[PDB]
Ligand binder design. Structure first.
Ligand SMILES: N[C@@H](CCCC[NH3+])C(=O)O
Ligand SMILES: N[C@@H](CCCC[NH3+])C(=O)O
Ligand SMILES: N[C@@H](CCCC[NH3+])C(=O)O
Ligand SMILES: N[C@@H](CCCC[NH3+])C(=O)O
Lengths: 294, 294, 294, 294
């Protein structure tokens, strides 16, 4: 599949900061019931940076168990250390994941050849399909369409991109360098609309955590070529997309879910369990606009 | 009225550097015959910065004359000096322009309140509709959706935006702040596709100078809601969009037209009448890919 | 000379926006009396963008007349249009200027070869020494040390740079490409200290408009190699440097001068004659800290 | 205590990728013998991202052992996860470190309040002095002078900053918000000169790995107030500063040391053990210019 609305799942915690397994399972079940087309456990939105390797692996395991092969599980296996990425990738494969989401190394700022070496090493270590997570706003480095194309040519299991550049011309450039069959998924909720118009086939989504049905219907409209209907969904959802990201998306999302479903707001430091009053007011207004709150 | 494929017309020069009125008229005639839905004389692509006031005014006059009310003429009237913008706007109005394209002040970096004051002064001085030209990559400053919305509320003749931010979420934000009836036109050829998906109704276009029929058909497909067909045009045109802008777009465009139509490559310093061999090779390949050269 | 504290002079206006010749003359006389080492009429801070060519030329003329050859007059002759730069440069030369300040073309975004052609054309048109004004925060383009070095090699009258990159390693790179004898002047008040440590010999200064004596003494300390004393001046002046630029520097400066010397706050649109309360409070506090107000 | 030339030590590896304890010890001995005034084990340059926790802790231990209290050891204890930072900080304290270098969280992009919470939690967990490592080019987020000042007020053991903003006005702003006694150390080799002119008292240095004596003498000149001599060292060292960073600094440094001292170029993926020919040529030329190679 690798298409449609694919939530980058939050990782719920109890007040003491421990992983809340029952809350996570309930979230996954609800996501599937509401029409989410795939699942990304332990991406950015799943607070990958503040989980231990054991916790990361466990959340991936739990997601696979709960999904029960109903929709593809694209497991977060990203690291700025190639050894760690391989370790996480191998666990996810053994646990029964359907694909891997692998971020460009952050902080250490490798060259394009370093990016090639990193992704090549992961691709050679596993048999699973790999989705490249290109996110310059977080990793600073930016995998060029040329480097991406080289990886596609070299490795049959490098199958797609979660493109969080926010530059929609990159979709067009990636079509040229990687082919029309290369799976392009939006890494940004607010531009998922234009992204699919350029050739994208879905979105790995933060907002889908809050509004899985509306997000799935939005993606279904674009698959059907009904962009007029898709724009109606954008009118309905854009205030939420924006409000969730006024402060870190993880925190915006957990606040939104605390209002709609009574989810816990707890996150791990340096993320904060609190938000500014204006952010909360904007999220409240966006939820009302979307019809998720009265 | 203001929609579809709207070329930001080049201003052809003769070898002494003077405006070539014959070549300009022929270009306008050909643009209309090939399906262009409107005309922007003396925008960025028309080398507004290197024309005198007299020359600027004359090119606007000539465009109006040649158009003969067949398509709307949205006259370039931008300046970083409010006095000059008013002077150019008043001339264009007297000459018979249908609208004005007014850029955000460049170099002097005004505040949001300065932007408001600038556009308010222009709007109060004329009766014509005004399209705000928001281009942070050139002007550095960026008119916020809030400032844009305030201008829309304050002035009935502020009717649209040529949005060259390259941030397609801005279209969605401008829909919220300015309304669904606010006329949004892409200021970037390469993302015109996603731009319309977000609610845009056309593109003020550099590439239309070279491929007016293909660009018009591309825009027509999106107006009809046929985004699958629009993507086919993007496949055909993207190499050209990219190649024209490897070096300044004015120079890329004039090279392309020198190959297809024998147009003079002459531009005014600090723009160059020459390009790098790799740029010319890429433009050549793009023209062949688009079916404009054999 | 071309060294020490060189104010980029404000252009005072009367309430109706006309150039106030008597106020300008008084400002220049006071600057010289307080120890300013040179003068830049009609730079950015002189509101070059909103003066007509006639007004630009007149202010340059007046500055030359008032200075009476006591300190060098480095006349603003910048334009994004090579023809206009030459026109302004030739007038300044005829009027008796000692040098020219020539900005990198803004808005139209030329290539490095375009920058070379622009500065070469100006250099060949005049006999006067030229100071390149490299300001990427306004012009977007950035003259590389390689391009700068090429201009120095090609033209004996390209003698220096007003470097507003804010990247002090550029001073070191420019020493390599242009030589140790190349005159480097800071284009940023807040980093004039580190700039001279790297090999700079002065600053073309906004803050010198407000505190010419303190700025001259600051520069004199660095010339003497007394960087400990220079740091004491930085402690005294930094709050003013910062406060003046919270909003556009022209407006911050004119407010500061309205408080200390009763100068008119009038500027030309899109600059504003007003500031936010917090900006005015910060400038007030900075003036008190510097000892310019009680 | 914390001043002068402080190398951010490389971590040498053997060909199997393991930490080379013999080579690391020899490097530390040589650094101290050549005049380095302090040591930072397992910073960015020490490849902190690609070490395991056990390896990170071991390299810190070894550095402390070899130093034998001759110069202060400022142990790398940075993480984007507050729990990990605390774990690493507590180990370093128990091992006998003199201070901690703690980076702003990377990738997860916390708010200013998140930064405050992160550094507060680390400061409360240990008794050791903490140097904040502010590096927007890697972490994206940027600790403001206001947030830094708040941390200084709240915690007596937050004593300094490794400032890698490359904005030298920040030193002046940090003097205001944090006080004149706040220990400011340059996080950039190429602007260490201007940094100290603004009030810095040293540099945590990549280049010191290659040229420890020249870097120590450079810093000694600035401490003595001899900025003319310091500039002479900048003339000698600038080509090396630049060449080391054409590609990742770790790799530039290890190449330089392979030429001068026979050090292994081995790094951990996604860093590469190879460089472009032009980079190696530039490093070669820089070493010859500095008198480190014939
Ligand atoms: N905090 C580290 C380790 C996380 C390990 C589990 N995902 C990082 O962001 O890379
Ligand atoms: N070169 C000036 C004047 C151009 C006047 C005609 N458009 C500018 O770019 O603002
Ligand atoms: N406003 C135009 C013309 C100014 C002419 C006098 N300096 C510009 O900024 O280029
Ligand atoms: N690769 C992870 C863990 C490194 C742990 C040792 N410093 C990171 O960069 O945060």
């Amino acid at each position: 599949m690798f298409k449609g609305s694919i939530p980058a799942l939050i990782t719920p915690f109890t007040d003491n900061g421990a992983v809340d397994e029952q809350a996570f399972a309930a979230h996954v079940e609800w996501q599937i019931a509401e029409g989410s087309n795939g699942l990304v456990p332990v991406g950015t939105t799943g607070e990958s940076p503040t989980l231990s390797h054991d916790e990361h692996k466990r959340v991936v395991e739990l997601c696979i168990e709960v999904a029960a092969k109903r929709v593809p599980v694209i497991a977060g296996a990203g690291s700025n250390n190639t050894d760690e990425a391989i370790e996480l990738a191998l666990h996810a494969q053994d646990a029964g994941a359907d694909a891997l989401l692998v971020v460009t190394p952050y902080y250490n700022k490798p060259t394009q050849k370093g990016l090639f070496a990193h992704f090549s090493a992961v691709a050679e270590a596993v048999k699973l399909p790999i989705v490249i997570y290109n996110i310059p706003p977080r990793s600073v480095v930016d995998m060029s369409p040329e480097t991406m194309g080289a990886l596609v040519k070299a490795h049959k299991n490098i199958v797609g991109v979660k493109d969080a550049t926010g530059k929609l011309d990159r979709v067009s450039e990636q079509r040229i360098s990687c082919g029309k069959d290369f799976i392009q998924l939006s890494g940004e909720d607010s531009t998922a609309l234009g992204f699919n118009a350029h050739g994208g086939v879905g979105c790995i989504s933060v907002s889908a955590n809050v509004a899985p049905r509306l997000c799935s219907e939005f993606q279904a409209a674009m698959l059907a070529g009904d962009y007029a209907k898709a724009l109606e969904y954008q009118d309905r959802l854009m205030p939420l997309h924006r409000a969730i990201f006024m402060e870190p998306g993880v925190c915006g999302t957990k606040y939104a879910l605390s209002k709609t479903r009574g989810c816990n707001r707890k996150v791990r430091s340096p993320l904060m369990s609190t938000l500014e009053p204006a952010t909360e007011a904007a999220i409240d207004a966006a939820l009302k606009h979307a019809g998720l709150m009265n």
